[PDB]
Write a protein that binds this DNA or RNA. Structure first.
Ligand SMILES: [Mg+2]
Ligand SMILES: [Mg+2]
Ligand SMILES: [Zn+2]
Length: 1434
RNA sequence: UGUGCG
């Protein structure tokens, strides 16, 4: 026991670093004799070792004296006001920059999370408090998961730690100086799956848990036999039938009447719409004049780069270099742009860049000519009168202005020459600075309109109509206006008729005319915009939100083709041949409206059309459907949209039209899903937060259980109330009471819960497939205090489970979101894994199972094929109404060694979740406080407002709400899925007991599809009363089991819907608008190739789901146009815009890139393909495999290709074929957005906990408080690509324009641009070694083509290496748009060659795209298939 | 840290 003591002492005395800081601790450590003080000094030394290593690694001065920040700043001579007690482990100063380096070690993930969050909040508080001291402070937190350091090596450190732990055990068994809590904490922090984590926590469950368990067992019988359960179900059904016939229970479903449903839809808003059958021509007339934007879109706005634009661009560029004062520089620049404009006007009588008496200066500013000249005169006079007081020289104001201009231009040229850009690349002409320059500016006068912005709605310059809805002119104008609105967000901050001297502006050209979007506010916020023109000013004025106008920016052709395909869906319908233009017009109008006025109310109105059309083609629908489909509408364009939708519906769903119902259903469903075109982002964050809190709070108030601000330790009143409400939840009566069943009230009946559990227990539901001391411990850098040690019924000793409430924004509103701590997330994950496995043991759940979803799809298709009855069910308020106590009771009453212990732990965790505390958002509390103050100081008084006001009048302010009646939306999702599965199995069993038929159910959390067998369908057709009684009994049973069938659920034989997938007979139902909108809305600020890959994935799934390939090619062209607007060069490896069906079905992304390259250089790819075929045959037998991956893939490129060609007996590519190249801006380093596979492996390996945990946690906490928009993402992408994003070989940062200018300097290199804008360069082989400045940025095209073709051949087969013969004009075929065809995709030694190819080819992610899900089913068009190319092995 | 309408 002392041999290891002497060994450890010798080890530390020999291998300790000889740092002056460690000397005192080493002297203390070695001199120790007693085991206790030896343990203390070993812990001391470890703490100092990690602290000092952290201080030195990050370059900071260690805090040995542990002085406060006050003492540090005062000792360094800087005074600060009083602050909180914060003592960092490390601190350093440089200039005015102060860095604190608080450090810690946590071997556990939950403890690490808690410590990092606490440390970050402490430093944030200190920084906010010191911001008054005018001193910078950037925090750095160094948290490591291990004790390893650079002062002590690994193995001796491990031996020291083990010996210290053994010494601790010895002292605790002998002296017991440490408290058992502190002893356990230190042992845990010294020793360095989740269900067994509850074994080490003390069981402190008192009588509260026993009372809860008794409550969930009281009145429940889970031992009923199948006979007794069947008799009880039969008695319940007979009583229900008798009461339903007598009218005591109201029927929740009605037989579908098409005319009645249409009439209900027509009178949906009959309080202000004083019409029902609107004329289509009058609707067009109203629509073209409804809004200022809509007026501008359909009006008659109709009518060589000049020097003003060149000078504006140059001076815009040189202002970011801060040549320097800001106001002075701005004024000087204004004068130069004015000179350029005057030069243009006197040269060719130009008129661009002017808005009457104001001109377009830098930073998107309108500048008044009068103000410019007065300011220039004042500034020149002031400088002249200042300077001439010294000497007597001719001032010559013109000369003074010229000299200032030359000085500014010289400084700007010097600044630009550093980054690699010369002035001649901006094409600026110095002739604009005439010798007569001052007088020329001061003797300049203009006459024109005065710019104005009308903020209020108190006449139109042009004729309000004339542009036809059929054409694409309206979409083009909307595209230009949307781009201008989005660009208005990029302006940097500078300092009724509202005509102004200076404001901000954006330019756009329409029909050869210049228009200016004028605004007076900067930022990504809603503001007033005014469209103005030089001829007549103030064309229109509106109040748009700029970050809601992204999807239309370059989508004119895409949207037009979307509408055209939708219209072609219904074109052979005979009754709609006369009313075919109107339909088209209506469709267009709806789209245009939702793209010009993107409103949440419009989004929900368009969404509800889906449920209307689903009920229209059904047999039975909920009686409350119509009330749910109606929304409050405020704006007049919303009522116009409703009228247009009503007209379209009444034309499509006319009684005279009965020809092709599947096509009309698809058309109306796509019109409904057009709601995805409107962005899903919140219009107002505070209003949506208020709505989310009301949705969270009203059900609890109706139930009657709301605990207001509960403590971590529960007061006896709160526990008593929780027990009472647990008893109340199971005290739901139904069908055997005077007042009858009360629908939609949360809770379950004891009788029906007993029936469910008994049926599960006896196997009725299964199938054949189943059967000093404390202070120093605190001072330690690795001692853990965040670990829970005991647990009660209310939760762990560390406190009850906290959940922050927020909203996840989506189409049709928001869904509630609960965010917990890491420890709470793991505790919940235990329950989730248990219930996921328990559901996996059974079948019918499609939530997480993927093959089960395919089984459900096949069953739905088979049901629809035979025209059997399908019941598509949504469950309303699945989250808020359903309760963790329900899950606890069900689990306690179910019957399936360690199983009893696992059930006990699960019950404890569910009891924890019962007592969870949800934190009211602080914005909501502040809004309620402001409303309360303004109401009490200065009539609706909503339920939530009444709640807050009642709490405010009695003192305490609500912060946390605890209630039995809530499960987190997505928190207990696997548990909810399991409950839905078992409850619906029991309900189907009861229905099969009652009738003769069976129901096949495929539940998934809240969504569900029930397929009725033949017997039930016959019952519906011949005995409607009994079928309706069965449906009502199903509704009643679901209500008794706390499953409230939504009013949007439908029973019918036409369509089966499940998880947003629709299936009918014969035809397919693609959500074309949904996929097109998803493609148009996903543009981020990632690296451009990543954006291309994401868009390619989206287009791949859209093609697989039935979108025609030409629309997808148009979407790809839209993405390339977005990239071209950022002026990013379009290399041949971004997107392919001439694809076909075979490219997406047979091929993959690599194959599409091969097709693009082969399109670019047809003749240079045949010989490469021949050599590749020879190579593939050589390596198929096994030879040439080992002498190719190491002799050629590592050698220099463009030189080994001829070696391969001569080695395989084929003609090597000629002189010119090697000259083809593409410009790679990431040749040295990836672009700044703020071997590839090797770095990917590194990042994945250093991600989870052992390495990179601190990095990933820092990025997560930085990106948590940073939320942006799609339009904000696009403007950020434009800013980043226009900035210095290109990294040179030596860590330098350059512009893309710098690289382009350096390329343009060399005359040998020539560019070649594709028909779609793809640029590839021909570099003469006479130069690849002389001037290596930018030749290093080029990559030969043939080598990348070879690598990609070889990798594609390995992953897909030899057919990709064959000759691509184009399609042969067979004859003439029908072009039926709804003529689909299903298709299946064509699916160790070569893995090494693949990974060797990927490290060699820095062009595309080849081997890493396997795991990032390949589509296993394609639905394409027969006409599109028969025009695809042929690629066969020969 | 953008000046870019395919
Ligand atoms: Mg410290
Ligand atoms: Mg559904
Ligand atoms: Zn001009």
């Amino acid at each position: 026991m002392e041999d290891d003591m002497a060994c450890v002492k010798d080890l530390v005395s020999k291998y300790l670093a000889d740092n002056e800081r460690l000397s005192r601790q080493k002297l203390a450590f070695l001199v120790q004799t007693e085991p206790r003080m030896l343990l203390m000094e070993g812990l001391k030394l470890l703490s100092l070792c990690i602290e000092i290593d952290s201080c030195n690694a990050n370059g900071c001065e260690h805090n040995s004296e542990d002085k406060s920040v006050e003492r540090i700043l005062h000792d360094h001579g800087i005074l600060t006001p009083s602050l909180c007690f914060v003592v960092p482990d490390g601190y350093k100063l440089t200039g005015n920059v102060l860095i604190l380096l608080e450090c810690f070690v946590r071997s556990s993930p939950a403890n690490f999370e808690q410590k990092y969050i606490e440390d970050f909040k402490k430093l944030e508080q200190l920084k906010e408090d010191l911001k008054s001291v005018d001193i910078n402070l950037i925090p750095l937190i160094d948290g490591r998961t291990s004790f390893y350091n650079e002062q002590i090596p690994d193995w001796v450190n491990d031996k020291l730690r083990d010996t210290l732990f053994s010494l601790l055990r010895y002292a605790q068994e002998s002296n017991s100086l440490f408290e058992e809590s502190e002893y356990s904490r230190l042992c845990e922090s010294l020793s360095m799956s989740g269900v067994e984590s509850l074994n080490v926590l003390l069981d402190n469950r008192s009588s509260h848990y026993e009372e809860i368990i008794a409550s969930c067992h009281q009145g429940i019988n889970n031992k009923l036999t199948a006979h007794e359960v069947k008799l009880q179900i039969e008695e319940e059904y007979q009583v229900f039938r008798n009461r339903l016939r007598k009218g005591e229970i109201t029927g929740q479903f009605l037989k579908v009447d098409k005319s009645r449903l249409l009439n209900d839809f027509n009178n949906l808003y009959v309080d202000e719409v004083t019409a029902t059958k609107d004329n289509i021509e009058h609707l067009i007339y109203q629509f073209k004049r409804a809004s200022p934007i809509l007026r501008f879109l359909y009006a008659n706005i109709g009518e060589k780069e000049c020097q003003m634009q060149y000078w504006r661009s140059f001076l815009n560029k040189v202002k970011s270099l801060r040549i320097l004062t800001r106001r002075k520089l701005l004024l000087i620049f204004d004068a130069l742009i004015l000179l350029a404009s005057i030069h243009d006007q006197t040269r060719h009588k130009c008129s661009k860049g002017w808005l009457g008496s104001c001109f377009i200066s830098v930073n998107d500013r309108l500048v008044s000519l009068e103000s410019t000249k007065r300011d220039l005169e004042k500034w020149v006079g002031r400088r002249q009168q200042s300077e001439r007081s010294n000497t007597i020289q001719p001032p010559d104001k013109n000369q003074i202005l010229i000299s200032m201009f030359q000085k500014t231009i010289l400084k700007a040229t010097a600044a630009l020459k550093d980054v690699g850009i010369s002035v001649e690349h901006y094409k600026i002409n110095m002739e604009v600075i005439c010798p007569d320059s001052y007088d020329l500016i001061l003797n300049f006068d203009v006459s024109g309109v005065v710019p104005t912005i009308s903020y209020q709605r108190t006449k139109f310059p042009f004729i309000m109509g004339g542009v036809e809805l059929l054409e694409s002119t309206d979409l083009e104008r909307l595209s230009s206006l949307s781009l201008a609105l989005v660009n208005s967000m990029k302006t940097s901050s500078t300092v009724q008729v509202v005509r102004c001297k200076e404001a901000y502006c954006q330019e756009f050209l329409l029909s050869g005319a210049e228009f200016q979007l004028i605004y007076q506010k900067t930022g990504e916020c809603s503001k007033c915009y005014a469209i103005n023109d030089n001829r007549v000013g103030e064309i229109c004025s509106f109040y748009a939100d700029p970050k809601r106008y992204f999807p239309a920016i370059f989508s004119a052709e895409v949207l037009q083709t979307t509408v055209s395909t939708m219209i072609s869906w219904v074109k052979d319908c005979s009754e709609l041949e006369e009313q075919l233009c109107n339909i088209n017009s209506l469709t267009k109008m709806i789209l245009v409206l939702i793209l010009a006025h993107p409103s949440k109310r419009s989004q929900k109105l368009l969404q509800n059309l889906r449920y209307f059309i689903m009920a229209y083609v059904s047999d039975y629908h909920h009686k409350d459907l119509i009330d749910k489909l109606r929304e409050e509408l405020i704006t007049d364009v919303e009522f116009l949209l409703y009228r247009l939708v009503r007209a379209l519906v009444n034309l499509i769903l006319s009684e005279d039209v009965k020809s092709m119902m599947t096509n009309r259903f698809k058309f109306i469903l796509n019109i409904s899903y057009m709601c995805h075109f409107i962005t899903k982002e919140t219009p107002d964050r505070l209003t949506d937060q208020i709505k989310c809190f009301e949705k969270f709070l009203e059900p609890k108030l109706e139930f009657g259980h709301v605990s207001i601000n509960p403590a971590d330790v529960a007061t006896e009143e709160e526990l008593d109330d929780m027990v009472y409400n647990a008893k109340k939840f199971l005290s739901k009566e139904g069908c055997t009471s005077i007042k009858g069943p009360d629908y939609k009230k949360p809770g379950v009946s004891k009788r029906f819960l007993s029936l469910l559990t008994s049926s599960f227990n006896n196997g009725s539901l299964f199938k054949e497939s189943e059967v000093c001391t404390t202070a120093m411990l605190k001072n330690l850098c690795f001692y853990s205090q965040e670990s829970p040690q005991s647990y009660s019924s209310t939760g762990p000793d560390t406190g009850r489970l906290k959940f922050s409430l927020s909203y996840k924004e989506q189409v049709g509103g928001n869904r509630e979101l609960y965010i917990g701590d890491l420890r709470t997330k793991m505790f919940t994950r235990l329950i989730e894994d248990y219930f996921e496995a328990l559901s996996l043991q059974l079948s019918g759940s499609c939530l997480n199972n993927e093959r089960e979803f395919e089984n459900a799809i096949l069953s739905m298709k088979l049901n629809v094929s035979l025209a059997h009855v399908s019941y598509s069910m949504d469950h309303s308020k699945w989250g808020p109404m359903m309760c963790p106590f329900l899950f606890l009771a069900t689990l306690q009453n179910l019957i399936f060694q360690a199983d009893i212990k696992g059930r006990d732990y699960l019950s404890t965790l569910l009891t924890w979740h019962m007592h969870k505390m949800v934190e009211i958002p602080f914005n909501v509390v502040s809004a309620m406080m402001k409303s309360f103050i303004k109401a009490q100081l200065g009539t609706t008084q909503s339920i939530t407002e009444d709640f807050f006001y009642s709490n405010f009048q009695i003192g305490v302010v609500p912060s946390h709400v605890s209630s039995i009646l809530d499960m987190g939306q997505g928190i207990l999702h696997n548990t909810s899925d399991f409950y839905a599965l078992i409850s619906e199995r029991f309900i189907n069993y009861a229905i099969s007991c009652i009738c003769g038929g069976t129901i096949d159910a495929y539940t998934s959390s809240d969504d569900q599809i029930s397929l009725f067998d033949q017997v039930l369908t016959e019952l519906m057709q011949r005995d409607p009363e009994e079928f309706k009684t069965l449906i009502e009994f199903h509704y009643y049973m679901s209500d008794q089991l706390n499953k409230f069938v939504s009013p949007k659920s439908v029973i019918g034989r036409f369509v089966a819907e499940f998880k947003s997938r629709f299936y009918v007979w014969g035809d397919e139902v693609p959500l074309l608008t949904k996929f097109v909108a998803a493609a148009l809305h996903n543009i981020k600020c990632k690296e451009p190739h990543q954006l291309a890959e994401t868009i390619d994935t989206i287009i791949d799934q859209s093609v697989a789901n039935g979108v025609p390939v030409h629309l997808c090619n148009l979407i790809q062209k839209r993405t390339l146009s977005l990239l071209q607007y950022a002026r990013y060069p379009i290399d041949p490896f971004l997107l392919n815009c001439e694809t076909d069906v075979r490219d997406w079905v047979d091929g993959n992304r690599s194959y599409r890139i091969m097709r693009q390259i082969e399109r670019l250089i047809p003749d240079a790819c045949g010989r490469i393909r021949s050599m590749l075929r020879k190579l593939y045959n050589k390596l198929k037998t096994g030879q040439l495999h080992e002498e190719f991956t190491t002799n050629y893939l590592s050698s220099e490129h463009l030189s080994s290709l001829s070696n391969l060609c001569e080695l395989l007996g084929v003609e090597p590519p000629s002189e010119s074929d090697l000259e083809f190249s593409w410009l790679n801006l990431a040749a040295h380093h990836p672009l700044r957005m703020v071997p590839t596979i090797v770095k990917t492996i590194q990042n994945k390996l250093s991600s989870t906990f052992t390495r990179g945990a601190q990095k990933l946690l820092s990025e997560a906490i930085n990106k948590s408080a940073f939320q942006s928009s799609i339009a904000s993402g696009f403007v950020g992408l434009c800013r980043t690509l226009g900035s210095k994003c290109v990294r040179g070989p030596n860590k330098e940062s350059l512009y893309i324009k710098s690289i382009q200018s350096l390329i343009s300097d060399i005359q040998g290199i020539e560019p070649l641009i594709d028909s779609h804008g793809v640029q590839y360069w021909r570099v003469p082989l006479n130069i690849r070694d002389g001037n290596e400045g930018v030749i290093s940025y080029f990559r030969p095209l043939l080598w990348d083509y070879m690598c990609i073709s070889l990798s594609t051949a390995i992953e897909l087969g030899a057919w990709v290496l064959g000759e691509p013969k184009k399609v042969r004009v067979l004859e003439f075929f029908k072009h039926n748009p709804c003529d689909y065809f299903p298709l299946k995709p064509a699916a160790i030694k070569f893995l090494d060659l693949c990974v060797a190819l990927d490290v060699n080819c820095e062009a595309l992610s080849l081997v890493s795209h396997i795991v990032k899900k390949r589509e296993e089913h394609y639905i394409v068009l027969s006409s599109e298939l028969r025009l695809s190319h042929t690629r066969t092995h020969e």
